[PDB]
């Protein structure tokens, strides 16, 4: 039905909930959502009740959100609590490692330093740092307290037994578990650093701003990043240990009332939320503090559906908790686009003799997600997907070079050219005269095929309905019920699919679309010469010649295919190999090693070699300021469920 069974861990929580139901009944109609309450002994009994279809929802902190996603519970984040304004909601906190400016040590040099922790068993002060530094700790790593004591040369971990672990109280004798201990909590951990007792403070991004009001005073502090570098305290979003969700509503992955909980909680925040009713308060109660939801909350936000607990919690948080729970301590997995790429990848796996391994996914964004969580390590991407992948935390390590060079490996290229290809016969066509005509795109989200012509179109029509602008066409990845899937050649299910199962996917595929169905194709400058003049042995291409095709110039002009240099839509960034930040060196090493040893499957078939990157090891740096700005302009018209999810963590 339309009732949501809410879980309460205490008697005072169960009564606030009866009040929640009663007040909801008094404002929502019969057809709409309703509340009902269930009482359980602890948070774990609540996670269990949901999994056992007894209850439906409960709000949890990140640590329990991890336990809830684990089997046999298999729960997931559905709704999130936000703090502060609606414009800038503060859904997550950043766990940071604060140090003093000029102390000259990195993350890998923490052994033998003096540490300041909020408290033993605390999230930002203990579980996250000690989780990440787990393998840097001396053996035996059990008891964990003993190992931490022998790693650092003196610590302050309040709430720890100083009788057993005296090195853990060296900076705050007794490890007092109250605010009476000057070095207790976030403020105290910062004070431990400020007073020069410790060298590093494991706190939140906010802690420095909560303890130092002057910008000049804060300037004398830096943060330790996982890449073994330092950054200013105001650069926490670029330099942190983990990104942690504050308070999350959870429900079953399958058979969980995800939409019914959202509807109920969206209606609830509108009627009894922050500054709404004097009658009932969702984030306050006389029976106690933080009952059902944190009193500090300003309301709720829907969790993007593509978002799974692992991605939601982030790689860093997950890795920290896995290390602590498991205690598990001591090649590149290449992601393949459908069975065609996988077949090639397999040959590469055996030939490289256990240097490169494979994983398959049907879409490029499914592969980016695999890289993100850890299922895969690296894959070669088109510029448009480097933007999405980069916004998801990944980094480029090698660039695809296409021009014939002496030392290809160390000679960077400005990029290829995005062109609008027409037939010489269709002389009526002009760059401006494309309204109501047939288009042929490589795929949606691609550089030459989508991002460049649709970006130049959006800057003119000032609207996102591209299916209205064109009569029909083929843009693999588009909604199967759109006019932009009507000219596709994929067999049943395979129609408008963003892989080689769809015959009009890619540079060659979009060219095939122009010849057989469409009247305009969006591809790279070298697509027409690579397929014409018999160069492509395929029946459709065998008898085609480049003399019969023209280019659409931005000034409503037409020029031959060879005259691409002065008749291109925009310069396109070369395809680059992306990876997880914490893999750069090994991917770079094995790929260079591999490159010297050994359709456009895995990489573009016109790749002469894989070239080194220097200062450009970020998506903004690689793609350039111009491309990023142009892709950013299309964010309003985005269809990517992955991009929507990645930007929920870092907009």
């Amino acid at each position: 039905d339309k009732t949501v069974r809410w879980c309460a861990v205490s008697e005072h929580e169960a009564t606030k909930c009866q009040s929640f139901r009663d007040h909801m009944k008094s404002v929502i109609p019969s057809d709409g959502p309703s509340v009902a309450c269930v009482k359980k002994a602890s948070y774990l009994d609540c996670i269990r009740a949901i999994a056992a279809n007894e209850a439906d929802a409960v709000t949890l902190d990140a640590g329990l959100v991890y336990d809830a996603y684990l089997a046999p519970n298999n729960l997931k984040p559905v709704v999130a609590e936000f703090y502060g304004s609606k414009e800038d909601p503060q859904t997550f906190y950043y766990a940071v490692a604060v140090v003093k400016k000029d102390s000259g040590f990195q993350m890998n040099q923490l052994r033998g330093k003096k540490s300041c922790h909020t408290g033993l068993g605390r999230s930002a002060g203990w579980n996250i740092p000690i989780g990440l530094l787990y393998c840097d700790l001396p053996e035996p790593r059990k008891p964990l307290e003993k190992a931490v004591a022998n790693f650092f040369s003196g610590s302050c971990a309040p709430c720890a037994d100083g009788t057993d672990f005296p090195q853990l109280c060296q900076l705050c004798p007794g490890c007092g578990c109250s605010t009476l201990n000057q070095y207790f909590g976030y403020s105290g951990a910062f004070k431990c650093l400020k007073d020069g007792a410790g060298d590093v403070a494991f706190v939140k991004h906010s802690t420095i701003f909560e303890n130092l009001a002057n910008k000049a005073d804060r300037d004398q502090y830096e943060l330790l990043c996982l890449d073994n570098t330092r950054k200013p305290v105001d650069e926490y979003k670029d330099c942190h240990l983990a990104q942690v969700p504050s308070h999350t509503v959870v429900a079953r992955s399958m058979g969980g009332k995800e939409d019914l909980i959202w509807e109920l909680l969206n209606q609830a925040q509108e009627h009894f939320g922050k500054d709404k009713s004097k009658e009932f308060q969702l984030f306050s109660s006389p029976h106690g503090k933080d009952l059902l939801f944190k009193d500090s909350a300003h309301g709720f936000l829907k969790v993007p559906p593509r978002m799974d607990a692992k991605m939601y919690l982030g790689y860093e948080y997950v890795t920290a908790i896995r290390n602590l729970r498991e205690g598990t301590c001591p090649p590149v997995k290449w992601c393949a686009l459908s069975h065609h790429e996988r077949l090639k990848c397999d040959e590469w796996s055996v030939n490289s003799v256990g240097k490169i391994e494979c994983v398959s996914a049907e879409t490029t964004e499914d592969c980016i997600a695999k890289i993100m969580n850890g299922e895969a390590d690296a894959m070669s991407l088109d510029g448009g997907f480097v933007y999405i992948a980069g916004k998801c935390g990944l980094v480029p390590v090698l660039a695809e070079n296409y021009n014939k060079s002496d030392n290809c490996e160390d000679t960077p290229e400005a990029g290829y050219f995005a062109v609008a290809v027409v037939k010489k016969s269709a002389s009526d066509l002009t760059w401006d005269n494309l309204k109501g005509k047939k288009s042929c795109h490589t795929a949606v989200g691609r550089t030459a095929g989508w991002n460049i012509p649709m970006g130049l179109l959006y800057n003119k029509i000032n609207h996102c309905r591209f299916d209205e602008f064109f009569s029909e066409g083929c843009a693999p990845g588009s909604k199967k019920d759109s006019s932009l899937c009507k000219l596709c050649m994929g067999s049943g299910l395979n129609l408008c699919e963003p892989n080689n199962k769809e015959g009009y996917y890619g540079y060659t595929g979009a060219f095939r679309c122009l010849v057989e169905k469409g009247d305009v194709a969006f591809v790279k400058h070298q697509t027409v010469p690579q397929n014409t003049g018999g160069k492509n042995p395929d029946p459709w291409a065998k008898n085609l010649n480049e003399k019969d095709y023209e280019l659409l110039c931005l000034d409503g002009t037409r020029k031959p295919v060879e005259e691409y240099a002065n008749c291109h839509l925009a310069r396109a960034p070369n395809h680059a190999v992306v990876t997880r930040k914490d893999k750069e060196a090994c991917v770079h090493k094995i790929l260079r090693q591999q490159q010297h040893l050994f359709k456009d499957l895995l990489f573009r078939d016109d790749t002469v070699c894989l070239a080194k990157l220097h200062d450009r090891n970020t998506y903004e740096k690689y793609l350039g300021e111009e491309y990023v700005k142009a892709v950013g302009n299309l964010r309003k018209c985005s269809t990517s469920s992955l991009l929507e999810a990645c930007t929920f963590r870092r907009p």
Binding site: A71, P72, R322, P331, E357, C358
Partner: protein, 320 residues
Amino acid sequence: YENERNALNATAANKVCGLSTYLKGIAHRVNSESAVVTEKLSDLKMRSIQLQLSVMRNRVPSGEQDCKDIRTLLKTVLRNEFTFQQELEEMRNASALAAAAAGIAAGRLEEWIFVFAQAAGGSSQFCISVGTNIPAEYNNLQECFDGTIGPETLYKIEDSRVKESAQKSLQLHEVLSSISFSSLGAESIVEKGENRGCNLMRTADGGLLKDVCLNRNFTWGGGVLNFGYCVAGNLKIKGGEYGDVGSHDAVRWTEDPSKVSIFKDVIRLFARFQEVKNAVVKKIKTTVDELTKCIGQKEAELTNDQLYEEFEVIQKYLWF
């Protein structure tokens, strides 16, 4: 870590196949052991024809060790001609059953491993491993296959090694113990700490079922490999049986193969055959021992070939 899908070690796979071909050899084993009894019986028929010739000479040793009653001697001789074949039927009835029951166990184990061996894909993902990014092939799985992995490459009951496995002097109890948890070792069963994508060994969501944990416990073999209703990630193998899987986490490899469903009947029915075989053999022994003390030395030193020529002579004489 949790998305971790371990593979079975080739060594563990071979040991299961090893037992499997021994079980296929139980048919030949019963046949060989049954054949000995008939040899021991043939000797009894030859020695009783030796007695009948001594009865006819009236030159039956006058052994006071009860050769005086000619009547009961010959009565038991004729009785034997019938009493033995119906007890020999009893042992063959048990031989067929043990042979079949064993065959069932063999097939159960074979299907399991063979399916795991076929669930291999070019590189990185497979169910039987060798440590490399390449799945185990027929050269690694020498006890399972006689060449390229397929249905016709598995060993048949009349095949080469099945027959030589039947003369290995290994007793059932020993071969069974070989696949126990102790005899294999936790490490040598499953390739832990490696994601080889084998869904056949995951009861949790995205394993046997794509969205949910199983409603029940699961078993490969007949209780050899056992799983809880929601086994994910790093396989926590411990020694135990289908009944020993109390948690959702639990992975249990057999410690006492006699507790395993499929082996129970093999053990039982091979024991039946042996029990009978040995009771028939003692019956022949006690009979041979009682007849021999009555055979005359002239007929005793008589060779099998001329023994049958001479029998015919007095036989045809007395008839007329």
